[PDB]
Amino acid sequence: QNITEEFYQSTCSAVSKGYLGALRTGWYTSVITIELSNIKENKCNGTDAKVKLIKQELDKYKNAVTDLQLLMQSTPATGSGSGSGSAIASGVAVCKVLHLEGEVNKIKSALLSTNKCVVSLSNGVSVLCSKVLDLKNYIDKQLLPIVNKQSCSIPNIETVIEFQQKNNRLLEITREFSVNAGVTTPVSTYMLTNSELLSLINDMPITNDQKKLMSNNVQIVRQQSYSIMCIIKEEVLAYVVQLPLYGVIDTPCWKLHTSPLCTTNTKEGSNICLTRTDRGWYCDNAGSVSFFPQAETCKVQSNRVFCDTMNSLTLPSEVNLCNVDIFNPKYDCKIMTSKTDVSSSVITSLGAIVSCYGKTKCTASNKNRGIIKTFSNGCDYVSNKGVDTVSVGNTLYYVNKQEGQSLYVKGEPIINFYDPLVFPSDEFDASISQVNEKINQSLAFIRKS
Amino acid sequence: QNITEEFYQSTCSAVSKGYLGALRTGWYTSVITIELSNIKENKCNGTDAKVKLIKQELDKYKNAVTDLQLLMQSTPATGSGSGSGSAIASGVAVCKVLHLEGEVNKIKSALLSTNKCVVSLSNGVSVLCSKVLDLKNYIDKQLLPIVNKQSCSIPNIETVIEFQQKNNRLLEITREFSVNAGVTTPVSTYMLTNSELLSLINDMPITNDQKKLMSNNVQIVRQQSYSIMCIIKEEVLAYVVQLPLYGVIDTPCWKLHTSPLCTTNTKEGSNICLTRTDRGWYCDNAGSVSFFPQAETCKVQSNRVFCDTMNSLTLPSEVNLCNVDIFNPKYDCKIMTSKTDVSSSVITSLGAIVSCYGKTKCTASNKNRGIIKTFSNGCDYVSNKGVDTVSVGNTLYYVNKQEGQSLYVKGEPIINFYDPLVFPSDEFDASISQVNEKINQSLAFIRKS
Amino acid sequence: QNITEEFYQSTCSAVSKGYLGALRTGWYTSVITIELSNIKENKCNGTDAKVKLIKQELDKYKNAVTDLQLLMQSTPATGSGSGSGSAIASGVAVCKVLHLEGEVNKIKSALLSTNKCVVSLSNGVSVLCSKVLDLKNYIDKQLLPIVNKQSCSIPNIETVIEFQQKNNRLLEITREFSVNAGVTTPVSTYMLTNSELLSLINDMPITNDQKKLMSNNVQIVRQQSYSIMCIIKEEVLAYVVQLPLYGVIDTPCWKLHTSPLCTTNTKEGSNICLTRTDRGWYCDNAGSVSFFPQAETCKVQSNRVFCDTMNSLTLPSEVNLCNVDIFNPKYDCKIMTSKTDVSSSVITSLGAIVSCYGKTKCTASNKNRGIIKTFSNGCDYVSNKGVDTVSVGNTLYYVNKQEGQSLYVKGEPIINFYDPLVFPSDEFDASISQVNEKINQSLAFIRKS
Ligand SMILES: *[C@@H]1O[C@H](CO)[C@@H](O)[C@H](O)[C@H]1NC(C)=O
Numbered sequence A, B, C: 001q002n003i004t005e006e007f008y009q010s011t012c013s014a015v016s017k018g019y020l021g022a023l024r025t026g027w028y029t030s031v032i033t034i035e036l037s038n039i040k041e042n043k044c045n046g047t048d049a050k051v052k053l054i055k056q057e058l059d060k061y062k063n064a065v066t067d068l069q070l071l072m073q074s075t076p077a078t079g080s081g082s083g084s085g086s087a088i089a090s091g092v093a094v095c096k097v098l099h100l101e102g103e104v105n106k107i108k109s110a111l112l113s114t115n116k117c118v119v120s121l122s123n124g125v126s127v128l129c130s131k132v133l134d135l136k137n138y139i140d141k142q143l144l145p146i147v148n149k150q151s152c153s154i155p156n157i158e159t160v161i162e163f164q165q166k167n168n169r170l171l172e173i174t175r176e177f178s179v180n181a182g183v184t185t186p187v188s189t190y191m192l193t194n195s196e197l198l199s200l201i202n203d204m205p206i207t208n209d210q211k212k213l214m215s216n217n218v219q220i221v222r223q224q225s226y227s228i229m230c231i232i233k234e235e236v237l238a239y240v241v242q243l244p245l246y247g248v249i250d251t252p253c254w255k256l257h258t259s260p261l262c263t264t265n266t267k268e269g270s271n272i273c274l275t276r277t278d279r280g281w282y283c284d285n286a287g288s289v290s291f292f293p294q295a296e297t298c299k300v301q302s303n304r305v306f307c308d309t310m311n312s313l314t315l316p317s318e319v320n321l322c323n324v325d326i327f328n329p330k331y332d333c334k335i336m337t338s339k340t341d342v343s344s345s346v347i348t349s350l351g352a353i354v355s356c357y358g359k360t361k362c363t364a365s366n367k368n369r370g371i372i373k374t375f376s377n378g379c380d381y382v383s384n385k386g387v388d389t390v391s392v393g394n395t396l397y398y399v400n401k402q403e404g405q406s407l408y409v410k411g412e413p414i415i416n417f418y419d420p421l422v423f424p425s426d427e428f429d430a431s432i433s434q435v436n437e438k439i440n441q442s443l444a445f446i447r448k449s
């Protein structure tokens, strides 16, 4: 609906609210096929320029078939990997089934009359299937009567051009698989055109709002999808496309922005600093909160966010209390500490946080008026209403011009509650209570002494 | 001019000097256009092979137009992002203006007679514009007289081939935008050929030395540029190219190399280590120093460095004192500590730093003579004069064969000034004074006790 | 042979054994050539459609030549770089030799009669050379008799099509070099087709098992290779391909998986945690152990691993004792500590580690039976026998279905040996003995007190 934002002066952080998230929980697996011609070289003494062109294109066809066959003798073990495991295990499992005898023929028979099909494999999985290119028919009908005789017939020039056009897609598909070891992401238009992807979506056994969501964000769907080279067997080239399944829809999401909060004493080396940890995207999910620490996990389109759950953490919903009261006793809010008071800015959804320290020149400007605000040392914020850019030292930042409402939540910088002499100043992954217990230990060594 | 280098034995670091930096401060925004034909299908009963080829290519043209139109219904909200904000906000702001009524026609009128133009938008921005492909004229003149009648005329075979060539660039442009959600970087030769880029540079209202700088480093310019898909309206396909504006030129730059400095006691677990932080590129800029911590921010061509200011920090010029005296009282030099005395090497501009610990075999070699130096435990350095490679354990490193002069600055390893029993040995982001104050606190707990 | 795996309950880690490693120690350098035609424009008044097509393709040829020439005036100084130095120094050194007078002609003469050659340069390096495209002969024989007269001859339509096909590869090669500043990796099929790569391998002066290894893993060879644009001189386009040389073969390798080990007290903020550091691939190498911390350094195909030594560390073989006894006195096993008891899983080679803390729902499932195991708080493990997935909170993980045998090594979680009140709970890069000495210091402040 409406994007809103809150800046917390006390902790030098901001939350952008109002987003609606779709979270990828599963995969749709589809088998894409190219029908091939099983032909060997039938060289006949031909020297005319058009037979030579047809022969040269037929060699590129053949080398594409054999290159794919060589690629397959080394199964997709270099596909993907992580502690998160295989993103392609769903597709890989369909490939395994496809190497079973009679399975390829089962797709042959469904595609004997139509372009799209549904096939129930012998493992219980009912996959959609699609033939996107028919080379077997083209080659068997227009080119074998040319080359498979004693002396070659002469094709017309339009057959030469037409065959280069049709074969082109096989060769590009083969080029993409060859440099990516048989797994590509995003899925190119060569693997699946927009028209084929949209038809695939439209033909799936899913609700209408799931069809409409994926159809209106096809480029995000492409970027979250995989194409896995499966098998070349019995005149069939088959590869599996994994499209994202969003098992969480329209869930409330927010983004946390953080920036270093330091004291502003004039003598360098006398200053302590703190920064809230775990910036990034948060989404309500199934009674908990899903947190996405890696910036690439979530794609944003205006009001809507699309996130992959594979590299997310599941947190209690009380994690949000760190944005109402960082000292709350229900969740141990996390911070890191340092004495590195370097100046910086963070562009948020509706404004900009500025951490200005030392001698840095920090300002906010408008295109037509120039400088309209000069920041003082400390952590501060400006909204995108009437501000176009922010400058911190020698770096210029553009503020997002998205519509929405910002709220400045005044409050004492919490760094001012700490005594600089007993402050644990080099904590890389700490927490409010962890810092307070280290301070309790440092007052105790002086209490008895 | 002359690249020179200094190795500081006392802190296991080196500085390479003599570079001349250009720092990207802004953007040139240019509107690139393709003139389209607004035609719907005019199917006529044609079965001849040449009409079929023309129809098939015209469908690929149409699907490219509609794919771009679908891509645009989801505005560039997944373009780029960071705490640094939008790198494309300048281009995005031009796109917004372009969606305003009459603006497209204003580019139409400037390009009514010539290929390049200058257009002042209704927001005060005077952009250069360029038409790189004219499909409207080609289609309206050579192909509508073919297909837009009752029965189709037959084109000659050269028209089939010529149209495939002209349409190819539209389709590739469309392919690139489709997998990148409407924003690409580097800018491909499909978006802008070298000839069009060089002409664009040459035609800009900028000084001659700025023209010559960008023209002599076009591949660096390409890699620092963006192409943003704007609009398809009124037979015009328009996208905006952002080229880097170097607002700092020929500024002195240097690169800091660092390596772990450890004691060399024979019993493992008894050794302490220190490493200088903030390796990377430094450039004088506007009375301060711009520091680039991320390795990809700066491209180097021989003597010259090209850096983006977006992910840089602005430091006081006294930061350089950490290379003359790391204990100086004007700047709090930063270090990290540990007990991980693993061996490694760092290839610098003119040589190699070697940190050799434990039982590691560390040597430097020449191609023709083999091993010419054997390192002992500690941190040491060799220049590229007469050395081709360095080996540390099982890893071989090639030294850069660039011309220049190295200087070995002798000095006591500062790790030897510290008492291993009160040394803070696991500081991730500390500083000379921060370590000294932690040591003062650790001598105080024993002073009274 | 057989992949096996051991899970160490005491330290929440697992080792996957049985892999056979090939480690890249060096480079094969090969010179790839394209023979060019040194022709300037010989415009003659021609307006026929076929001369126009030939002229237009000849301009694309010419602009490709000049674009490559402009790219070369800026030598490969933006190729690659790191503290590890140039991965391409071997190739770059061949380019330098190639700019020497008479060297190009020396490759001309070897390729005067055959397609492949061996040439000894004046620096003692005997490189294999290959001509992959002959444009000089095609242009001088089929196209100069067309355009280089007073009025242009008319080519047949097959010459137009044939020349577009032959020139295409020059233009794509030029496109790839243009956006990558003259250095590409992986090496595309445009740079080197599978047939040319396999022939290059087969023709090298290396043993038969090295030929067979690289020929059976060509896509891994491609991904570990470089293509470096060298020179355009005297009708020769030359670029150098660097293929990996595996100087270590069939060496035993293993992979270390780690996960956080925390106490499981019910009150949040009262829990301490530890995690073993230095997860990743380890390989026996030359009496030491090569360790690869970066996930992309090693490619895995079933039973076999292929690693680059450039970003590896060399460790004593006693590093493996951290997998038999983490308290052993021969090697100081490394750990990091924290109070962040967030739940997670790690998919291993043959199973899954699960660290379940707080209120997280953690389970393992089978496709046909659903949930078959529910984890309790702590660190635990399940093998891939009869398990398909694992769920931790809202994230689902797929287990690898590779064949092999897992072993569960029971043992007391070592985190239970530590007193939570004197535990150093925020150590980013520590070690068993380092933690024990910090605890000794914390018992001493209370011993006297
Ligand atoms: C430190 O001691 C005070 C005094 O009892 C107590 O209120 C506070 O909660 C303690 N903090 C920690 C982290 O133990």
Ligand SMILES: *[C@@H]1O[C@H](CO)[C@@H](O)[C@H](O)[C@H]1NC(C)=O
Pocket (backbone or CB within 6 Å): B433, B434, B436, B437, B438, B440
């Ligand atoms: C530690 O104490 C000595 C003695 O007064 C002083 O010279 C030094 O500057 C102190 N260091 C810090 C970091 O406070």
Ligand SMILES: *[C@@H]1O[C@H](CO)[C@@H](O)[C@H](O)[C@H]1NC(C)=O
Pocket (backbone or CB within 6 Å): C433, C434, C436, C437, C438, C440
């Ligand atoms: C701590 O002290 C005990 C008692 O002497 C000793 O056994 C142990 O090795 C010490 N640990 C360290 C790391 O010094």
